[PDB]
Amino acid sequence: TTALVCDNGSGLVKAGFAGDDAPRAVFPSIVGRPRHQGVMVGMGQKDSYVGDEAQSKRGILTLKYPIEHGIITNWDDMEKIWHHTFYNELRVAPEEHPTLLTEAPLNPKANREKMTQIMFETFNVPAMYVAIQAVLSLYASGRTTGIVLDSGDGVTHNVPIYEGYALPHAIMRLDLAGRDLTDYLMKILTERGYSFVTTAEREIVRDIKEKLCYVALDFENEMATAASSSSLEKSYELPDGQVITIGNERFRCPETLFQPSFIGMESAGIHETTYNSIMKCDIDIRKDLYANNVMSGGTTMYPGIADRMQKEITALAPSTMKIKIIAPPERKYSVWIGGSILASLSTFQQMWITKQEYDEAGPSIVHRKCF
């Protein structure tokens, strides 16, 4: 009873409640199970583990992540997170709750059905409404006009809008995000020397990539420098004390976005692909859209990229257009916070699919009710 506010995207859980102005808690969407036998069963640690408590204990366990179109899903034991996430981390089962939900476009049709078959026939939530997560950033930021080029950890989009009318032929889905970097990123530096790494260490290649790396500002001459130079070394210390001298690395992968051709790819650059996408975007407001961009979304704190984009946007920009590109604080959190603005609206509660509607349409309501 009442409704609740969170981020449920492929990266971090960012759980909170309605009437806050940040998530209550921010943590990884990890779960899994002892592939290494917990032999002395009950030996001060679990039979299966989640999030932080799995990460605190990780090596015993095979630990999971869910999605790619026609190449990854797991659907069921998403439960295994959820119910504890709820009846412990929300400290309630959503079986009680009028409820906020979110999704993304062009899932398999049946995706919506597995969701809803769970929501009702499993979790028995009374009433609820699904939406696009970017709407909450827009609840916060209030823009009419712009393209939300974005990456999470686990998904990418462009989102053109104009004066209402978020563009249904020009808003985009792509699987690639903050995820896929670390894999390539691992491949090299037994070159640097570090002959000692796997998945369980890909862990820290998730990490330093985000703690201190920035997107290169003009990577060509940063590498013309590196090909002769050693001044860059904001280095890292291995687990109990070896400083791996490091710090030119701290931007070196970040051309791969402008050049998926690095990874051999049939894809043009990020910017090229977005300029191509602008041909699918409206013909007219290609005037406007330069003067029309401000930060929100989890990645939006990241260094070296924002100028690089404004600069590359500029390097492809027309005359008669002003290249407004701006980064307000807490941009990383404005989806959670926008969800707590949305929680003010009794009409969004009038927007609920009731469990009743998943009975009285039969199941069949979902592709013809939620946002």
Partner 1 sequence: MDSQGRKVVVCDNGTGFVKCGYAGSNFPEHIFPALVGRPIIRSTTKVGNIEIKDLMVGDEASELRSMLEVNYPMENGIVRNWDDMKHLWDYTFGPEKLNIDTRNCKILLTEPPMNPTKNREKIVEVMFETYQFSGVYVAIQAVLTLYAQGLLTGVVVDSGDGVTHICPVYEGFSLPHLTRRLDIAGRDITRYLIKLLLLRGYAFNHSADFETVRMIKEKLCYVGYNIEQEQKLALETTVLVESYTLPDGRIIKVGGERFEAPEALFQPHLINVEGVGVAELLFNTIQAADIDTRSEFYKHIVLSGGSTMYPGLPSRLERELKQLYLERVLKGDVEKLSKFKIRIEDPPRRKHMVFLGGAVLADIMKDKDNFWMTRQEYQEKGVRVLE
Partner 2 sequence: MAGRLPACVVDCGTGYTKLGYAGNTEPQFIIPSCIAIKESAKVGDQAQRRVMKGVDDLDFFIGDEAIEKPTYATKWPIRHGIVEDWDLMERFMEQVIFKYLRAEPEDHYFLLTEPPLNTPENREYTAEIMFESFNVPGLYIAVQAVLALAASWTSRQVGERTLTGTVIDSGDGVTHVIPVAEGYVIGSCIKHIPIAGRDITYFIQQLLRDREVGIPPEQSLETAKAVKERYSYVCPDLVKEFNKYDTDGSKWIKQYTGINAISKKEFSIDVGYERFLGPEIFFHPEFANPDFTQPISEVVDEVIQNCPIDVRRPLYKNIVLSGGSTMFRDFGRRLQRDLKRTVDARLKLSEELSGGRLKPKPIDVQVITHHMQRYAVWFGGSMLASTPEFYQVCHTKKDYEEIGPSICRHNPVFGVMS
> Which residues of this chain interact with partner 1, rule CB under 8 A?
35-36, 62, 71, 184, 187-188, 190-191, 193, 195, 262-264
- H-helix or E-strand spanning residue 342: helix 334-342
**Could you write out the DSSP letters of every residue in 216-242?**
-SSHHHHHHHHTT--TT---EE-TTS-
Whole-number minimum distance, CB 191 to partner 1, in Å?
Answer: 5
Q: What does 320 bind: partner 2, partner 1, none (CB cut-off 5 to 8 Å by kind)?
A: none
Q: Is 264 in the site for partner 2 (CB under 8 A)?
A: no
Phi, psi dihedral angles at 127 (to 5 degrees): -155, 140
Q: Is 44 in the site for partner 2 (CB under 8 A)?
A: yes
* Stretch of residues binding partner 2 (CB under 8 A), selected from 29-37, 107-115, 158-166, 173-181: 29-37
Q: What does 43 bind: partner 2, partner 1, none (CB cut-off 5 to 8 Å by kind)?
A: partner 2
Q: Which two tokens stand for residue 128?
A: 């609820």
Whole-number Å distance between alpha carbons of 325 and 307 = 8
Partners of 98 in the beta sheet? 127
Q: What does 38 bind: partner 2, partner 1, none (CB cut-off 5 to 8 Å by kind)?
A: partner 2
Q: Which two tokens stand for residue 281?
A: 């975007």
Among 241, 264, 318, 362, binds partner 2 (CB under 8 A): 241
Nearer to partner 1, 188 or 224 (CB): 188
Among 110, 188, 224, 243, binds partner 2 (CB under 8 A): 243
Whole-number Å distance between alpha carbons of 269 and 333 = 28
Q: Is 227 in the site for partner 2 (CB under 8 A)?
A: no
Q: Which two tokens stand for residue 328?
A: 């307000």
Whole-number minimum distance, CB 33 to partner 2, in Å?
Answer: 13
Nearer to partner 1, 3 or 185 (CB): 185
Nearer to partner 1, 190 or 242 (CB): 190
Report the 10 Å Cβ neighbour count for 272: 16
Nearer to partner 1, 188 or 291 (CB): 188
Q: What does 62 bind: partner 2, partner 1, none (CB cut-off 5 to 8 Å by kind)?
A: partner 1
By C-alpha distance, which of 295, 292, 293, 291 is closest to 328?
Answer: 295
Among 18, 25, 26, 60, binds partner 2 (CB under 8 A): 60
Whole-number minimum distance, CB 194 to partner 1, in Å?
Answer: 10
User: Would residue 5 be called left, alpha or beta, if left means φ above 0 and alpha means ψ between -120 and 50 degrees?
Assistant: beta
Q: Is 2 in the site for partner 2 (CB under 8 A)?
A: no
Sign of CA dihedral 366, 24, 305, 285: positive
Nearer to partner 1, 34 or 338 (CB): 34
Q: Is 224 in the site for partner 2 (CB under 8 A)?
A: no
Partners of 6 in the beta sheet? 15
Report the 10 Å Cβ neighbour count for 348: 16
Phi, psi dihedral angles at 360 (to 5 degrees): -95, -25
Q: Which two tokens stand for residue 209?
A: 């990539």
Cα-based distances in Å from 236 to 36, 195, 212, 274: 30, 16, 10, 35
Q: Say how many residues touch partner 2, by CB under 8 A.
A: 25
Whole-number Å distance between alpha carbons of 371 and 364 = 15
Whole-number Å distance between alpha carbons of 193 and 135 = 46
- Amino acid at residue number 320: T
Nearer to partner 2, 199 or 344 (CB): 199
Q: Is 195 in the site for partner 2 (CB under 8 A)?
A: no
Nearer to partner 1, 41 or 283 (CB): 41
Nearer to partner 1, 74 or 190 (CB): 190
Among 245, 276, 356, 364, binds partner 2 (CB under 8 A): 245
**Residues found near partner 2 in the complex (CB under 8 A):** 34, 36-41, 43-45, 57, 59-60, 193, 196, 200, 235, 237, 239-245
